[PDB]
Design a protein around this ligand. Structure first.
Ligand SMILES: *[C@@H]1O[C@H](CO)[C@@H](O[C@@H]2O[C@H](CO)[C@@H](O)[C@H](O)[C@H]2NC(C)=O)[C@H](O)[C@H]1NC(C)=O
Ligand SMILES: *[C@@H]1O[C@H](CO)[C@@H](O[C@@H]2O[C@H](CO)[C@@H](O)[C@H](O)[C@H]2NC(C)=O)[C@H](O)[C@H]1NC(C)=O
Ligand SMILES: *[C@@H]1O[C@H](CO)[C@@H](O[C@@H]2O[C@H](CO)[C@@H](O)[C@H](O)[C@H]2NC(C)=O)[C@H](O)[C@H]1NC(C)=O
Lengths: 48, 48, 117, 49
């Protein structure tokens, strides 16, 4: 099964129903995308 | 005698990081934790 | 606690000098709502049938301050996002009778109705 | 109404190259050994759409 479809099965497994996941595909994808863009600002001496 | 030997041998016993009032707050929060209901998946709801 | 903090969704691993470096993407809620829940629902017939949720809660759609016991309809919600939806047999088990369960007279879910035509 | 498998898959019994959408019957199989069998309520949940 593709990567995009197996992420939505991991969000359905923690308690988000299929009617929330279908109405908020783009918002969930945007929030996932701007968390991988923030990994490359965590290579500093404050990051333990 | 090994408490008063810090000042004749040349070592020091350092105080702990937290006082006994902080670790009495750690075990009081362990006694009354909510931990939402035990038929649900996830760790993000809190059922009192 | 194992794969980070919160509810674990996914993890990635990259190479680092002398080892591996993990990124644990988890789920973090940023607001909440205080919903009135129930342990379960039962009808008022003999023999009594009773239901319970599956990975979620039986809640009240708290909108106004006038709905009470003749319009107190119960909905189902997932445990990680508040969005009430109708109670069907896709999200409720049958259980043995408890005392903490609500006794319902009208507005029954379809699991609690007379299935015989 | 919608259903989903229980510890297995909803598969097609791939035998010929003529069965398509009027004879595409779906069977159930266990996840560790391929052996198609009919779909009853012993191997399927009801789910939301
Ligand atoms: C639960 O209550 C909410 C209101 O708080 C209902 O949401 C409304 O739905 C109608 C029709 O879809 C919309 O026109 C309104 O704008 C919605 N309200 C808000 C605040 O967004 C919801 O329908 C109720 N749930 C059920 C299952 O009846
Ligand atoms: C629903 O009705 C039943 C009646 O069968 C209630 O069960 C009684 O509960 C009281 C205390 O709440 C006990 O003293 C009785 O012994 C129970 N009766 C039986 C036959 O076990 C139940 O409490 C009601 N639920 C609610 C929420 O009112
Ligand atoms: C799925 O297809 C297979 C054929 O690939 C069917 O197996 C046949 O069953 C009949 C009757 O039991 C036998 O005479 C054949 O020899 C079988 N074929 C083979 C290749 O062994 C099987 O019955 C089908 N499954 C279902 C549920 O209809």
């Amino acid at each position: 099964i593709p990567f995009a479809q197996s992420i939505f099965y991991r969000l359905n497994g923690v308690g988000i129903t299929q009617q929330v996941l279908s109405e908020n595909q783009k918002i969930i994808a945007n929030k996932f995308n701007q968390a991988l863009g923030a990994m490359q600002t965590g290579f500093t001496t404050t990051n333990l | 005698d090994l408490i008063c030997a810090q000042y004749v041998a040349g070592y020091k016993v350092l105080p702990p990081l937290y006082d006994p009032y902080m670790e009495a707050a750690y075990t009081s929060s362990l006694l009354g934790s909510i931990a939402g209901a035990s038929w649900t998946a996830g760790l993000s709801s809190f059922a009192a | 606690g194992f794969c980070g903090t919160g509810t674990h969704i996914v993890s990635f691993a990259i190479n680092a000098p002398n080892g591996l470096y993990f990124f644990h993407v988890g789920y973090q809620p940023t607001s909440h709502v205080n919903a009135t829940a129930a342990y379960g629902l039962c009808n008022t017939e003999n023999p009594q049938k009773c239901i319970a949720p599956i990975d979620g809660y039986f809640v009240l759609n708290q909108t106004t301050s006038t709905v009470a016991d003749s319009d107190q309809q119960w909905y189902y919600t997932g445990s990680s996002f508040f969005h009430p939806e109708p109670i069907t047999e896709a999200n409720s088990k049958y259980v043995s009778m408890d005392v903490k369960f609500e006794n319902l007279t009208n507005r029954l879910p379809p699991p609690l109705l007379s299935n015989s035509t």
